Symmetry: D2
Subunit: 227 residues, 4 copies
């Protein structure tokens, strides 16, 4: 696609989140860069309002799948870049099993030369000492496959997957993601055949950072089509 | 599951289909056996009303995913076998791009020792000389991945894939499958995490058979989960 | 250029002369292949009487040129690149806690037919073992066939390990060491590392009176996205 | 395996390399940690002798496959952890196409609680303004599959793969890796069936490091077996 050309090199990224979980208001800013040639992303996030009231891992998926590596034989199936530079709206409900849910709406688009992800997040019905508000999640992250299907009737894609968040007692907290992506612009976009993105995420801390924060490095690669 | 135990050996299969496509009524009977240990099916189908009014390949998916091979590490994700012996209802709409659609409802269940797939099919809005009613599909079949997700609210699964049917002129006719499976019985079933079935289908003819018929050999293997 | 020979259905002939612990036998096979789908259909007949080893032990010996190589991997298809002049395929197959087969085969076009002519020598088999004692089930598992280039022979090296189910619930392993080299002087494609995913269905012809095997196989290359 | 248990948590790593390429002697020290539960490694390398006389990316493979994530269903095929704590010897020849070769011998083993990788490297027959000694490789890295087979006679494994190093002019420099691993100790080890490791590597710099260095984050995951 035309938008594919915008991602041949390193692109700067900004992320802004305004959040409210069970009435706890918070904001996070992020910055870094993506190199879609390698499916690779490097981002740092800071909670600018103080302590983050939910665990950092629960927000990883909310905080730019346009940075995925699509191998040459799958490039006709990259919706995310074809929607650029005008961007796409990304909407999710994330259901935490036996707990509350997040609803998010984000615009992912170029603003100048920067790829910007602006998100609003509302969480409701969380248990006050559940795994989320009780900060019982480990600071780590599993590998996941993100399943993508076209929704031609709605001019976009539907995406589903279930994050496994490791809990400090050895169990797992499931987070079932229902996601829709829709172009913002008027121009032609690619609607893909069914496939998935293999995603690996490394969480870490910046030793020179005293605020509440997360450093994220991710690899994302499309797979599953040989026709 | 308990249903899994019913599939450790060779199981006889019966298939019955009552069809109506654009008013053309027809019936097909099939028989054979399945060996889920190898994910392998062998089936022969006969049009008992005379000439089949649609191409045989368009009906392959309609004519028993309980015969899939689920590797040991994925056995908790096998909805199909978990619903047995009481069975499941399988409903599809199959949209042939630039042409009509099939709507199917089937019961797949044990009747004595035999796995039986009983189907009603209604096709509408087909073009009198499109690829289907004009018999322009080649007598072959491509390999496909069948994408499976849980549908917890319906105590079953939602399934999607798009068959690529080769046309005699070198082009491809797509057939977009929207599928749902729901248990017939009240007992618990296994609701899976997202995965897919890799399916390979070989079509042939019985040299001793003078009626309009199709011989099908299929391999079906679950994949995509390592957690 | 060899690719072009496989765009449609290609008739196949297989001929094998075997000697296992001195038991001499011959098998003739025929059918066809459609590499567009990676699909083979073959029927084999023991023309000397009863086959003295189980039919499943010979499946891999009885035309990987019929593999489906998806478009993005077409530069890695050695097998077709060697056609029509063909390739030599040699193996040693070690049956764990039992004897071994050694095979040498030529796979090439003879007219418009793809022909696999094999010599097989088996030695040191136990008369009461899984092979000569016919304790293998008439079935077959799915396997990955691992391929590497052998630049100094201008061919490939191939390795994999067949799991043959035994009639008591155990498994008999057959470790395959394989080498393929071009017969002709023409250029071939030396591949990057990859594998072939293979599935095999064994059956019987209900009217065939001779000792025989009907085989349907699907073979698809995978592992490369660069 | 017993050695598997040593990797259930975060394990500190030390790396030491003495090298000679075309007579250019250098030393590199590295340190960090590995978390095999996630197949994750974080390492920083410093050239303690001054400037590195070869490009950093050519040494990535030389600088602890015991940190691979083996999924539960493949754990009997993890030779690398089975050889711990006594360790293994890893030997390679790396043939850079149209250029010279590296030959390496390393011991990878526990010294107390730390996993240490100690390497000697000799490089010969490099061209003076080839891609290597001419420093024409880009500071990036592609994803690779690492192919493993058992070597029963050596009580270890034989490993082969070909690294694709991107060049500054758009081309690729190949580096064909012939590798052998053998146990240092005499205790039992796990000899695997054929499989591979999917590997992803992110190269970066420490903004406050003035010495010639490389920061490496890697993910490694075993695949290819379902039996």
């Amino acid at each position: 696609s035309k938008g594919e050309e915008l991602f041949t090199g390193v692109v700067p990224i900004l992320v802004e989140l305004d959040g409210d979980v069970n009435g706890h208001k918070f904001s996070v800013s992020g910055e870094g860069e993506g190199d879609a040639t390698y499916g690779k992303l490097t981002l740092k996030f800071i909670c600018t309002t103080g302590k983050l009231p939910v665990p950092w891992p629960t927000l990883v998926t909310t905080f730019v799948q346009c940075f995925s590596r699509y191998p040459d034989h799958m490039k006709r199936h990259d919706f995310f870049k074809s929607a650029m530079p005008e961007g796409y709206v990304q909407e999710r409900t994330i259901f935490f099993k036996d707990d509350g849910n997040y609803k998010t709406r984000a615009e992912v688009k170029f603003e100048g030369d920067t790829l910007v992800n602006r998100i609003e997040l509302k969480g409701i019905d969380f248990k006050e000492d559940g795994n989320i508000l009780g900060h019982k999640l480990e600071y780590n992250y599993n590998s996941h496959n993100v399943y993508i299907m076209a929704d031609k009737q709605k001019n976009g894609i539907k995406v589903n997957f279930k994050i496994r968040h490791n809990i400090e007692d050895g169990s797992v907290q499931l987070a079932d993601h229902y996601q829709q992506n829709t172009p913002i612009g008027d121009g032609p976009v690619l609607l893909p055949d069914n496939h998935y993105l293999s995603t690996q995420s490394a969480l870490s801390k910046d030793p020179n950072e005293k605020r509440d924060h997360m450093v994220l490095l991710e690899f994302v690669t499309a797979a599953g089509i040989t026709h």
